[model samples]
Target: RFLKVKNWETDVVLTDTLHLKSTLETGCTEHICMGSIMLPVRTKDQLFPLAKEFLDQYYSSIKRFGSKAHMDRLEEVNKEIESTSTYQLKDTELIYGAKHAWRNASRCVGRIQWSKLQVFDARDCTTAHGMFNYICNHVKYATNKGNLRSAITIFPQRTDGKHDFRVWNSQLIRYAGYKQPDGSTLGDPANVQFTEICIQQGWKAPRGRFDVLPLLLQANGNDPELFQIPPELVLEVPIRHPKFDWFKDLGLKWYGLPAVSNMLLEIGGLEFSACPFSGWYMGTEIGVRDYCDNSRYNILEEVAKKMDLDMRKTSSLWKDQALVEINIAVLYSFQSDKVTIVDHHSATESFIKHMENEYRCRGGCPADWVWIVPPMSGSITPVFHQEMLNYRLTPSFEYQPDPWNTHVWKG
Candidate 1:
């Protein structure tokens, strides 16, 4: 399409052209050579300009933050992209990019401290065995002796315009699920599909409900490798309320960290399909979503039964009562274990502050009301009253297609 301008040097007669001067001045630092075609702006050539723009912005941000980062080869990297279709990030760039990805992540309520995100550069890793070793290190370090720090371990990027490195597991830390012939699941039902995928890929499923799923890694297009998490490496909290002593008898517990895997890390138009990122858990993420959600453990009934609530009557608000207690138990358990965890109330307040800061600094903040509002108390939190509009931002972490059975639905 042709683009008009405030002032054209030659008053160039190009039809279907849009606002070239205005767009070029503000829209992008680099331009793509788009001809008559308008919709296919995703080609390798088009994406390179985006990459160039991202790289320029990334370097500028780092330098602005008092880092004397040299972009001497920035031009060379851009040239290399024309030839090889990819470029590698310096260690500092990787760190900042990962952190920036988190900051740009609208879905995350804890993104206010994204600058504190830890990045482990494993781009040098080339094999599944090596990948497993790095993943173990990432798990250990991010676990932080139960203090729980947000961290990401980045793998090598695939420059061939295809995803190479991939993690089959949903998270670095997740409970395993075992299915019985009677259609009952023993562990986290959320992991049942992932557990089945692991089994089909040759992982031995454990018989218990709280077993950690092994890291199923594929590096550099190699066959997948399975690595069991040493019980000591996975930090878990025994779920017991401060007042309710019987809660411990439920045999319920959860992993300390929620390090998500199986997501693509796209930075400066490059994709690290195997990168795993983690953050400390918000109590409700486990207590409300994982434990009480109908599709998950569906433990409201059990907890209500144990509490001796009026189970026969829906008007008794048994589910609501059970949810609050369950969340309380999670908060108490994590606190007792000295694990870094945030309650829904505190998380909401923090998010409100984050939004205020973003507004002061950036004029606007994108948020999803459904997520920004805490699950338990919808009307009370500041997020509930605030209207939000979700929008796309680049150099972000995104869920990718399943590495296994690419042609099939994510069953």
Candidate 2:
């Protein structure tokens, strides 16, 4: 499913598909099973350049200024990666590559602290239960009682020519949307499909709109397993207005961490389907996109009515006024709750600085203009005026099919 976030659209399919196998021995990791849906595996010809870039950056990172020993080995590794169907990355290489992948994520507006990401390697864990454990830890550590820190936990690579492991949820923090008997969603509308799938897998539905979904894990040759996240570990903030006394009466809320779980992380010819990474929320992401979205909370009308805006006139700008207040409420509420949240203005400024820093450190910064610009007050942000180039960079992340669909593979 596609979710239109304010002006930009992002995939809302949190349930990742399985492309665990090197489906085509034809030197590409991109499984074309789902009608040209591509994962980030590259041909030797395609990979050699990214490999060369990775090696160069990794070497420069540790200040390895000496005798071509490391470079020679990497070149040899490149040779093996070129003709060989299988490839391997050292722990250090994987960590660096993952960080760079986040740094290179063009769609992300919050890449300013990409280097500070804490990467956890769970490559040895071969079971669904183990995957669940590591992910639970990711939620606890990243949430950190509202002092949220960016983190990613990576599972094993697909070295056995099959799907090794995967986390079905797109993020460690997500609300479970339950479909009631009347066919209306009780929780987040975004998660209705996932909530149904979990029910089929024996998860009992909760009677709340904001019930957090459990971790769904699947390893190669294993049935999918479900593990509910501890309620205490997943931090959630109740929505209330600083000025509007009636706002608290609305019973609105949202989670703290915006972690993505289902996207495949590709670094230097290897794809980690289960690398879940998270960042703190930018207020508009919650207020404008999540709550205001028609398919999601659809709270704009309710909010506007509360303010008693003249909605009869297009010139009255009821939506615009309500959006600002909503964002104001979101930012104020997070701060009041002591949760780490960035206002869109500040986030946009940070992104501008990130772009400038990238321009100096690297030759160019890859960013999507629409994504880099905030949904609200776009004309005021520096990113709104700046020209950006959007292109695929490897050691990158890509989305795949949902796990249930993967079971039927293009059915």
Candidate 3:
């Protein structure tokens, strides 16, 4: 059955006294999360004249870089990137590292065993495989210089006793380059896997969440793989929910996540992150989530009210409260540029939480999801793209202020 919206303009609130915070975090390995993986693949190929023959091939020029706005800027970074690295010649190791990544991307796209795609029932298995193959094919024939697609990524690790976890909410940021790239100052194009923002990480809540809201959110995705890789395999992505359905297997324990998240916003709370883009995105999320699930979110407020008595009592009650209460709340915001209600569903539920009043007024730091975007030549916002992430769900959808265009993120 399709999900029924309780209300378009209100938050969904749920409060339970059975699930403990520790049990939820420890038992589930901590899901209901958010994060982004930043992968920097060298975008261009070196031409013979300005290419490998010129001894600048390690991070050389390309047929052309990004859009006019982003290209010229890329040309300059090329010099800096060229200057930053100590490795002068392409080490067989570097070549080997670059080769393997491309191979894996190819296997994903070209279908190493074309006839076998039918065996896998999971969408993640199929989409990831297909996407990987697509990358390989695109890069294999993109240019003749033999450079493969380079990438950086953050994988989700769900704690469903499977050694992985995910996010509690969705956060879309206003990035530096939301507009299309042009001819004059653009650099190379990197395939953004900033697609999903769900991650698995331990974090403190934002400050001043007294009435509602959190301070800090952390990474809950898989351990990042940043170094060498060959092009023959898919870079071991962990716990990819159904590619077409982001909410598949999310579980029932997370019924209150949205409420907790929304309440924080209604009260004007803060959400910060260690990553660059997260600060902007997390702040925006307070509003988006408040709108998406307002009807049911009150469940959290109800529970907070009930726990007010014990919270005043002290440490033991606090620990006890987190153990059996729906102290944590996770909400679905956006999956990608293309979003579907069915695809972006999430849950952060459980019966054995560790902290008694974890979801109570007490709060800490903010959550974050950091990612990188290519910059333009000597951009005024130069290093802006590199120093910080353009936090977002690749393409974000709207859920409030205008319901007509809500969730319509057409990039």
Candidate 4:
């Protein structure tokens, strides 16, 4: 009962019986899988087909497929593309497209709440100052005094393939990283390069462990400008443990909103280069990846030492114990402050439900198993056992090359 699957592009084939029905030809083959990689950018000439496909999807979702209004709208878009080489999305279409993009984000486990996203249209913004204002408003609206809301603020689209708006930060809220004189990182090591860029752009580094970085915004393919986010709008939760009294002394804190600022929003063959999106944080994102990763904060050994665990041996499972306590501290701190956050176990459970619902409605759900599974407690999560087939579906959030690497500055 084996099923044979072949890749048209690579001419490679894979045979599987168990998971063949749910599989999609997603550039994965018998020898290798590029599931976690970014999809290549589509060219300007490739717009019409993609736009048509998206329109078909949009109309079908609204139960207006092939209707007179749908057909006329398609024709209108076609004429516009024929004349201008690109078309604009209506406000209604933009809203639906933003939500659809979140729904199609295979790496996100929070897609269960995709339909409730608040899409803020800033497509008319032409200056970096305007971008800063819009971002501030988005931060204020999404934070909502610690009760986080899922939202995205979409800036202008890429026109002429040259004039693209970009937000240079990885996230709307992130701590600055300063490389110390002793070759050690004083803050979050993940942001050392960005922090240096900010310093070069005349931003005075506070040189604190958790100082919020300024927003770097580029408009119309120009050089980026630094803008300091108001301290009041940035909701931060100080980490404290439920049982450990000494945890608060570590001076650990994180922003309440997890707004990603670097991803591109692709919908109906239209490319929005600067769409910042926000959602509530998951506990493990703070506990495991941010705090435990060696390249980042690397706080595992310190926390383990505080727990009085044997630091010299692997047999004692000191790291594992520290991880649990760290996660507990994260959840407790956020919960005590009435800030919105989800534990990994609860998030994975909800993702399983989302997968079931997606399968029933769309016949297939594109997922990257590695991402959907929590960083810690891998096997204990339900999603760890789930055999997922990853594929690209639009509207999608895509990883674009860094603006500094791709843009040519004009004086």
Candidate 5:
């Protein structure tokens, strides 16, 4: 009673501060990894049953397909983590580790570097296929008519940001074996509902690669990963077109380092909104500018004039430095008035043959040929950058450099 009368209000000042310098000191762009979603508490009640029905329906397949195969794969990773650290993991820590372990294992198997991953009923694709289709085909309003087939697809991009634009990743696979983004959407089931995804370097929304034979890629029964591409679908290999002498050692300076290098395909991110190289990103005949036209191709003649890019000088296929490999997919000016449909190795042999026929190069529509930016890539993780900046592993790091779920958990 005496204390209550004395001073019920001592008034406290809250502490509020942030590390401005350390935050800014981070050099490489601080992509926020991925965003998180928080459903209402009521949704939790709904989620369990939804998850239950999902699991029950697929219970047999889950068992047959090795439902928790991801578990052993996870343990394999924990062993690696255990070997690195000295302390025992707590229950909460183990749970966190499992989340990260899943992300890590998925990456080793070729999900993009920071790919958005989730394990669901695996049957969810059947329902989401329609949404996936729309996202893929319509995301980019094709400037030219009937150019690219539905091979290209929509992928998650930053929901709202300055450089926001949807891009494509090359590694195509089925999570549940039931869906593919042919005439439908191609992406992760979880990504189908979200606003963002950690995609590979080059991301153009769902669109076909130039012209790969449809029967092979579209043939539902065969796997696309291997060379299951059918011979009937293969276009007659275009005569070497007097391109780069194979003797040049493929003679390219393929960087083993992780700096932003140019590619045959030019892709842009919301943060880095402009395609890396205009004249080169999508080369002369069928470059990225035309594929995802951010106004470069519409007035390409003027852009080239303003940028001092002599379309004529860069016209020839052989001397050009833009190609990643010698596999130049070309046809005698089927689309462009002045140039051939020549593209370097990112355009696969199977794709080249398929494209020639798809565009009717031998006969003719011969109007426009669009090559959505190829799935080219270059990356620098904390480790890669450290090797460049620090040159040696020093002892002062009291924290983990970068964990897979470092962002997942943050979400």
Candidate 6:
């Protein structure tokens, strides 16, 4: 039997046949779904096959499939693997792989700009100092004086599944969270543990509400070293509403770049343990998640009070009103400052086009439905109504264990 469904927007019909087979199993059943779980890592025995598969994909993408050059490269890779238990990716191949990883990031809603990402190759870095220098350069280049550009800087890959180069901070830029004597957090609660770690490493804590955290970098399986980011290199925006001048008095500000520094980049069978990638933030990411989340700044009640909204009753919808105004302030402030940021509506529309393009190029696109939908305004967004299928794809970004927790210290 066959089942058919129609998309009212596109007026297209998708037919499902019982005999069709899926390329991957997502660990889902009629009664349950595990779409957000991380996929398993490849084993040693699986390396060669995965490498070959990636090479095939790479060659095909360049329209050089089955050519003498492709075949010769494959042979060289196999021989190198046999002798050294690992192989090297050419600079061009590394660039391609990094871009592919961004394109295949299932949780990212900004993947429509994947191909435009700039790859900074720092794979030759061998010291913590070198890692810090490379990171500074990445921040400068990606920041672009508020006209943010998407970029990534990849550190050296792991060897023997150990001796990895890792970035200790979850993001390239984060505000410090200080635990006050009153049992309250003064900054971002999401980073409180990391802030404590930085303090323990001989770094002085300023205890300011928005003090920038220093970088803790590790190389060659050694203990991480702390380095403070140059103040001039970090770009920040002061929040203000277009209409409410009092909103500026709240003294809220956020860093311009959203650089994710702690994720692993897997290409073929190779693991890049410290590849920091950055892009501009979507407005809601700061306004909703950062400012309004209970674990973070938690400014909703304060903003509601400023707006003279009745906070005592849920029926007053004060939370909803405050949320919209905050989001509006975020968008307006960024725009007024000539910073590059996307509002949720425009972002979701762009993603829909990207999904259609991906389906035409590849038979399927892997997307986590929960992540693709914006945090606020669920049903109103087009993505909320569309069905999404999630699955793991090769050349992808993955969550890795924090370097501090996984490190085996050398005596």
Off by over 4 Å in 5: 1-127, 139-143, 146-281, 284-411
* Candidates in order: C-alpha RMSD to true structure: 9.6, 8.5, 25.0, 5.1, 23.9, 2.6
Screening candidate 4 with a backbone cut-off below 3 angstroms (N, C-alpha, C), the clashing residue pairs are: none
Cα lDDT of model 2 by residue, 1-411, tens digit: 211112122221121111121122222235542222233334566666666666766787788834486678577887787668546778899889999889878789999999899999888888887887888888888889999999999888865434657777867777888767888778788988887878888998775877888778887636678898878887889888889999888898889989998888888667787788898999999999898888988888888899999999869999898888888889989999999999877888888777766755665566667567787898877667666655556678777777776653311
Question: Deviation in angstroms for 21 in model 2?
Answer: 28
Clashes of each: 6, 4, 134, 0, 23, 0
lDDT of 3 by residue, 1-411 (tens): 111112112333223221221111111114532334222112223221222222232222232334553344445545643564211212332232223222212102111212221111111212233323332333232211322222211122112222221112222111111113452211101101121121112222121111111122223222321111132321111111222232222221211111111011000010111111110112113222321233322232334344553555565455334222331222132222111112111100110011112223211101121311111111222212122111111001112221112223222
Q: Which stretches of candidate 4 lie over 4 Å from their true place?
A: 1-27, 36-44
Which candidate has the top score in TM-score? Answer: 6
Q: How do all the candidates rank in terms of lDDT, highest first?
A: 4, 6, 2, 1, 5, 3
Question: Residue 206's C-alpha lDDT in candidate 6?
Answer: 88
Better of 5 and 6 by lDDT: 6
Q: For residues 67-125, could you state the per-residue lDDT of candidate 4 as single tens digits?
A: 99899998999888888888999898999999988987889999999999999999989
TM-score of 1: 0.85
Candidates in order, TM-scores: namely 0.85, 0.84, 0.16, 0.92, 0.19, 0.94
- The regions of model 2 sitting more than 4 angstroms off are 1-53, 63-66, 75-85, 180-183, 408-411
Clashing pairs in 2: 17-401, 20-163, 170-261, 187-209
User: What lDDT score belongs to each candidate, Candidate 1 first?
Assistant: 0.75, 0.76, 0.21, 0.87, 0.22, 0.86
Better of 1 and 4 by lDDT: 4
Candidate 3 deviant stretches above 4 angstroms: 1-129, 132-252, 255-296, 301-411
Candidate number with the higher TM-score (3 or 5): 5
Instruction: Give the better candidate number (2 or 6) by lDDT.
Output: 6
